[PDB]
């Protein structure tokens, strides 16, 4: 990543073993559960494109997903090249192409050069946006169940139903009342409109 | 977070993998037991609003609770906008709205700018107060038992009863004597008024 | 905590996740065994009153004990207010009350201000003394057995008896000879007076 | 490794126990799965040739592979000597041979001298390229199955088939449609040409 | 401990949670096996007397041993007072007594003052010597078996016998040949005198 | 160890708990497998002789081996004294003897003095060479099997045979073809001379 030192210049630092290990584990344990994406974003804070490629490449399974991500990345790179065409002056900074931003045709030195320039071309933040676009599509695709099939069981506590319901909504990116069981539905209808979630859960406890 | 370096300027530092992992674990193990809230507060020391969103977003279950928290946050943001209306001068710091404080409409750079300004607008501390308000409501809601149903069993050591009693009081945010068993109640009545907890526990040992 | 940096000023540092986790574990594993108190003292080195409250508040069980501790803290605060009454000059340091020292009516900024003042008012060290007073009472109260009931078994090695004996003495805060079994007692009587513990253990091996 | 300090000079730092342990583990757990190579590259960031030899030498099994790697390294060193022949001036930097780059005939001091020279001779990056060439051959050799033998089972979800298919392609360094089962193949034929992987997976869900 | 910072002054640093935990574990796992003493010495590098008391006090079992250690410490303190009697000048450093060195009658500030003085009075190194004297006696006392009872079994490999033999010698602080079994003894007699241990082990393989 | 700080002077640093623990574990798990020696070398980077003694002394078993190592060290020290005889000028650096290099008759201060002198007498690197000489002899001695007894089984994959073969060669510090099974031997004979290991393994797959 690029960090500020103790004396206030922006410098390159090796990706840490703890960071590498945390990512691989979270993917092993959680696959593409929606909470994996904010974890990715936080572990890749200050990342160069090389660091972002390292994190993606260290994943060993889920190679269907990692291929779909490559496709999304290539579409975003091609749209970048559409908006930002490029033509080098000895010793001068060249302009990045899509593939430079994705770290396939750029060196670490060029990446540091762009990201620390005054003003900076934040190639790591741009690439991370493309990656997260790609990851969100994967989360949606690997969502097991439609929100239409989340209905409260006759013996299911209302709290457990609401947990399943919002978990599903998150992955898919008055239905709550419609899908409640007969007993809670009756209570909820009687609360009248514009009830908060806290009030609905309280009433159905 | 925003930290002081070794040479005494306030600077942004990446959230650490250890911090991220500690929070997710504590939520996995303890759900919304009341001791989870001081742990949240300590792990989020120096946090920007972006860091606070990261910590909340990395939680994978309990999505009913995380929705109720969003509701509380939106009420606090709306009250902020009531007390602090806003109208930008090239190169100058804009005034934060509620949604800026909650980190949904503000950038990390703006967040750092507010928090390090002379004098600072402590947007991370303000947002953390809203979050903790929301978390306290969740702790109360997920409290399993009323204090009225904590009564000492005929064979239950007085110490174990007092542990259950104050554990319940904490989550709900002379009853101790009333709810004691016949044998301890008699001892306790005879101690006369204004006995410390240490004396009551000693007497009932 | 308040630490010295690499360049020799006293500065505030966030409590670390490792410190938070170590305390909670030691309390989970050892409850109020006497060795928990030196561990508390070492983990809270440089602590502000806010840090000390964090460590106490992150404990989830033992709420009878944590209530008894609050009582001890309130007695020490009230004695502080007796010895050190207080009456603020714009921009000047106010004098701390008992509740300021215990961190319930003081801010982190005021706490840092006192502890780094020339000369310092060491509010973290004062509060830690009150806490340890309270913890020692809890250790004594949760001591399972009287020293009078620690007697060497007919088949119990003398070493194992002495371990039980001094473990009990520690928690309760010639008896060793009196409580020995017939065979060791005879050996020990014959050593004559003023024998070291090493000599007694050697003789009874 | 060679790192930048807090005050911006390039200096030698000991390889950390965490780095040493992470490599040995990943090799214990994953053998020569293709994802082991980006992990190697990331753990050896800033490495001197001595550090790279340390990491390879700390592997205890897989000695057939480690011998094959030595062979690849010796071929790359010999090609280096072909392109860059060498002839020492008291106190002056000598030119590195192949075996100097591989760290068998060079000292740590000479290695630091080359890598920190203005302009630097990046002997650690050159050696790492040779090592990765050698590792890629090993990954290909230890690939269990041909891509021709990855075919979708009659009851196998299309997602699981695509995961096996791209996992195999990665290790080997319209076939996807040809190797699909009758039911998915029919769906896929009907999508018409130039379908993305996302569309194929969606259609076959 | 007292450490050198990044800018070369000797300063006090909190004992780390990792250090505290490592000591307690090693004592839990290894009791007073002789290898515990070099581990103690290494974990207490730079220790103040307060740090050394912390490490000893955090041990929860083995209270017979910890009492025997107190006795040894009190004898060494009393011998110190014999060799170095003491008589304070406002603002000046007082001379340490035995109990000051053992950290029972001295403050952390006084301890730092002695250890960083020009020239320093190394109170932490002096106390550590007393502690190690005491620990060595405990290792000897808890040694299970005499070296006279370590004899090679008729089916016991010579290597395993030599491991038991030197393990016992270490704890107790031509016998090797005398205690060998008939078959190895014969081989060893025939090697003639002044054979190295390597030669004896080779011969008996 | 002796490290460079953030501001570029060579200074003494305490051996870390992580380093101490990593060594003890690796010896517990791997005994004197050949890969233990590069691990020792990497964990002892920058070590003083005191640090090297700490690492050796913290090993609890294998006391036959640790005695054989002492013997090797004493022979290397005696050869040092042969090549470098010594005769002290107030305040001046004395010349190290063998036993000074092995850290038995030298203090930590003298050790730091030698290693940081201009030009340095690298007593830690010299001692580490003696130790590694001694360790290599132990690895050879504890090698279970001769290379002559590594032969491919009738049903043993060629890869697994080559792994056993080079593992044994490493510990002992056309035979591969001679010891192959009939079926692979035939294939290998037919490849003709000067085949790489990769080609032999490919042919026998
Ligand atoms: O951030 P973490 O993955 O939780 O690991 C930390 C980290 O070590 P790594 O940089 O090797 O990962 C610390 O280094 P810093 O963050 O302070 O630079 C180190 O602390 P030290 O500075 O004291 O070496 C500490 O080790 P310690 O146990 O000594 O506190 C260790 O945590 P663990 O070794 O407990 O996993």
Oligomer type: homohexamer
Write down the CATH topology of the largest domain in chain A.
Human Immunodeficiency Virus Type 1 Capsid Protein
CATH class of the largest domain in chain A: Mainly Alpha
- Order of SSEs of chain A, N→C? EEHHHHHHHHHHH
The rounded Rg of chain A comes to 23 Å
Number of helices of chain A: 11
Strand content of chain A: under 5%
The largest sheet of chain A, given as strand count, sense and whether it forms a barrel, is:
2 strands, antiparallel
Most residues in contact, chain pair and counts: A-B, 34 and 30 residues
Number of strands of chain A: 2
Distance between the termini of chain A: 48 Å
Strand order of the largest sheet of chain A: 1-2
CATH architecture of the largest domain in chain A: Orthogonal Bundle
The CATH superfamily of the largest domain in chain A is Human Immunodeficiency Virus Type 1 Capsid Protein
Find the structural class of chain A using helix and strand composition: mainly alpha
User: Which range best describes the helical content of chain A: under 10%, 10-25%, 25-40%, 40-55%, 55-70% or over 70%?
Assistant: 55-70%
Query: Any ligands, ions or cofactors bound here, and which?
Result: inositol hexakisphosphate
Q: What count of domains describes the coordinates of chain A?
A: 2
Overall 3D shape of chain A:
elongated
Region (Interaction with human PPIA/CYPA and NUP153) (chains A, B, C, D, E, F): 57-92
Protein name (chains A, B, C, D, E, F): Capsid protein p24
Region (Dimerization/Multimerization of capsid protein p24) (chains A, B, C, D, E, F): 142-205
Subcellular location (chains A, B, C, D, E, F): Virion
């Amino acid at each position: 990543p690029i960090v500020q030192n103790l004396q206030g210049q922006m410098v390159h630092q090796c990706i840490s073993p703890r960071t590498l290990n945390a990512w691989v584990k979270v993917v092993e344990e959680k696959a593409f559960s929606p909470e994996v994406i904010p974890m990715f974003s936080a572990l890749s804070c200050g990342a160069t494109p090389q660091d972002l490629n390292t994190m993606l490449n260290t994943v060993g399974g889920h190679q269907a997903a990692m291929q779909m991500l490559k496709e999304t990345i290539n579409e975003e790179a091609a749209e970048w090249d559409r908006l930002h065409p490029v033509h080098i002056a000895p010793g001068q900074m060249r302009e990045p192409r899509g593939s430079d931003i994705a770290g396939t045709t750029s060196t670490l030195q060029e990446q540091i050069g762009w990201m620390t320039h005054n003003p900076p071309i934040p190639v790591g933040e741009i690439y991370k946006r493309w990656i997260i676009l790609g990851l969100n599509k994967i989360v949606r695709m690997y969502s097991p169940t439609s929100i239409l099939d989340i209905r409260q069981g006759p013996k299911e506590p209302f709290r457990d139903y609401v947990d399943r319901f919002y978990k599903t909504l998150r992955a898919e990116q008055t239905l709550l009342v419609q899908n409640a069981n007969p007993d809670c539905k009756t209570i909820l209808k009687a609360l009248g409109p514009g009830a908060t979630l806290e009030e609905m859960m309280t009433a159905c406890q």
